[PDB]
Amino acid sequence: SMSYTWTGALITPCAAEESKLPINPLSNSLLRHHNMVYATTSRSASLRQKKVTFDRLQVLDDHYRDVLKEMKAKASTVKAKLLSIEEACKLTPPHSAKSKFGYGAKDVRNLSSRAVNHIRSVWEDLLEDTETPIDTTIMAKSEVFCVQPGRKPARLIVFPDLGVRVCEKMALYDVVSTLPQAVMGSSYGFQYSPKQRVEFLVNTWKSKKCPMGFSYDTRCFDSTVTESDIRVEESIYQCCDLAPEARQAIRSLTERLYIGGPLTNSKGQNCGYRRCRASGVLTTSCGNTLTCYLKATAACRAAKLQDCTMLVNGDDLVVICESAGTQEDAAALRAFTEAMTRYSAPPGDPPQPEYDLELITSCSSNVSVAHDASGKRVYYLTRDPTTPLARAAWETARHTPINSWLGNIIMYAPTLWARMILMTHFFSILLAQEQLEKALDCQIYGACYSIEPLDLPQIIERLHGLSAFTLHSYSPGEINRVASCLRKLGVPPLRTWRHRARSVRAKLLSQGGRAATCGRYLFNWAVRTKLKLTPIPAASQLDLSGWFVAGYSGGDIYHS
Numbered sequence: 001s002m003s004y005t006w007t008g009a010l011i012t013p014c015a016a017e018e019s020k021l022p023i024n025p026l027s028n029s030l031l032r033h034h035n036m037v038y039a040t041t042s043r044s045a046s047l048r049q050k051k052v053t054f055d056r057l058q059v060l061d062d063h064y065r066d067v068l069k070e071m072k073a074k075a076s077t078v079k080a081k082l083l084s085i086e087e088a089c090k091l092t093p094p095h096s097a098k099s100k101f102g103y104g105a106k107d108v109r110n111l112s113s114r115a116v117n118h119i120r121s122v123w124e125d126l127l128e129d130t131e132t133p134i135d136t137t138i139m140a141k142s143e144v145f146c147v148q149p150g151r152k153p154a155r156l157i158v159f160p161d162l163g164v165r166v167c168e169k170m171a172l173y174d175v176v177s178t179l180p181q182a183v184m185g186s187s188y189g190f191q192y193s194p195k196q197r198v199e200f201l202v203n204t205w206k207s208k209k210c211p212m213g214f215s216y217d218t219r220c221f222d223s224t225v226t227e228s229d230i231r232v233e234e235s236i237y238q239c240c241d242l243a244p245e246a247r248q249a250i251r252s253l254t255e256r257l258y259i260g261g262p263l264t265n266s267k268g269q270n271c272g273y274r275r276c277r278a279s280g281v282l283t284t285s286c287g288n289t290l291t292c293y294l295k296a297t298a299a300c301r302a303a304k305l306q307d308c309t310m311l312v313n314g315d316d317l318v319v320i321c322e323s324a325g326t327q328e329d330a331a332a333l334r335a336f337t338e339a340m341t342r343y344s345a346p347p348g349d350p351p352q353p354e355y356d357l358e359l360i361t362s363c364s365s366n367v368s369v370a371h372d373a374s375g376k377r378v379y380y381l382t383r384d385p386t387t388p389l390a391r392a393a394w395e396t397a398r399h400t401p402i403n404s405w406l407g408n409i410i411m412y413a414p415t416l417w418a419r420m421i422l423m424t425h426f427f428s429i430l431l432a433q434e435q436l437e438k439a440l441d442c443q444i445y446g447a448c449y450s451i452e453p454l455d456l457p458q459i460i461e462r463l464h465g466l467s468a469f470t471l472h473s474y475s476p477g478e479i480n481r482v483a484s485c486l487r488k489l490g491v492p493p494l495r496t497w498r499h500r501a502r503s504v505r506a507k508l509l510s511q512g513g514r515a516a517t518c519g520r521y522l523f524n525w526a527v528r529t530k531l532k533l534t535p536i537p538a539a540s541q542l543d544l545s546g547w548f549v550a551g552y553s554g555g556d557i558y559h560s
């Protein structure tokens, strides 16, 4: 069937939308080529629509069937619980989109009876109506990027009302947080912290006689997802021991929301129909990871690829296997892609086989190596700084709900670019406005957390280890990439950053306390007379477990 059907009404904005980067006195310290930075607007929706709209083609075979059964067998072991309305309400973010029934995020978290009552209403309805298609809203997502030798058309977000959203949680939150793990095991990409991820890639890599890996990029994965896939996906959820209420809710949500439904623009007009995965629902992450793993695993048997391990993060997939020879690999890879095409997961960019782990890119990230205080090789997760930086610049000029910079510093703490640019820049600014104390929000795996800037040392040490503060002698490849990017966006030279860092470091050490701890560890790279960095007390006792459990992009999740 057609992934989408349009009535003609436009994808409309609910407020004015900024697209250019504001010439701000602060952002300018970061990068000078500000016209290279942009934000997507509904003004490009049409372009994105033409791409995400097409007729899916799917042919399932015995391999596909075999893997599904293997997957169902494992899910059979799961027993998912039903969340109460309070638990579900506590999971709602404060910024989350208000309901069209007289209540907003804040009311939900406060358990305001007007809200909680309508919520119960939607739930009762999910227990009685097993057919009626639930309304969704379509919007153009506003994200920051850096131009390219053109521009990226906005991405479309389809999401149900806050009411239906607190319910999805009530019936599927426990499921999407545990099932993927039970089914895919070591392959479930969201259970890892960046370091546990690198360790997993490296370990998997070194376990092959002659390794070979490749990343597979599906063309607009979300729309490749068919009704069949969605039902199959639910068939798995159904293997869980579930309270009657939840089993019904899942059955209904599957037929009324997940498999497809009507579309409405911000102006309340009928835009069309969706017969594929909605980005803004709770099951997107889990659903896509399971679906991708299913097809990919089944595809490897089809393409005769030998002993292949996989790491899946939603629509993002990377695969490592035993090389059978240069030409044979290129053969099987193509054989793979076709299998996936039949499964309705054609590639955006044809996949190319890699024989060096540093060249494989998954989750926009690659694995690279540097050295610690003692000169020991250290492996860490990195990526291209372009978008991170561009967004960092934008988040400097405008007040913004989520701070991609904070999250990026956390996830990429050991990288050269995060430590030299981001850490310096933001502390330099925070320190100024005396904001070092204020807590900020950011997202890790789509989930939303509230982080205190002054706890970055503990956090970083816990998730990465002390070496995150002393890595040096990065790879020439990471060095080249970083440089090119920094040069492209007009970022100040290394020296300007070393100076700026030496400065903020001093201003931090004087403040004493956590501030001193920040200056001491975070900026140890700037001073000639390095200090001895010892394990930070607070780090010793931190529960960063909930941080790396599952994915929740578009899931409307907030962990307090």
Ligand SMILES: O=c1ncn(Cc2c(F)cc(F)cc2F)c2ccc(Oc3cccc(-c4nc5ncccc5o4)c3C(F)(F)F)cc12
Residues within 6 Å of the ligand: 415, 416, 417, 418, 419, 420, 470, 471, 472, 473, 474, 475, 478, 479, 480, 482, 483, 484, 486, 487, 491, 492, 493, 494, 525
């Ligand atoms: O391997 C290293 N080992 C240690 N240090 C020191 C160091 C560090 F251990 C951590 C940190 F947090 C900052 C920092 F200093 C390096 C510092 C810079 C570098 O790479 C270079 C070298 C020369 C120029 C540029 C360079 N080209 C540029 N072009 C435009 C703007 C800025 C630029 O900087 C770069 C860089 F873009 F950083 F990758 C490599 C290393």
Ligand SMILES: [Mg+2]
Residues within 6 Å of the ligand: 191, 192, 545, 548, 549
């Ligand atoms: Mg974990």
Ligand SMILES: [Mg+2]
Residues within 6 Å of the ligand: 217, 218, 219, 220, 221, 222, 315, 348
């Ligand atoms: Mg895609």
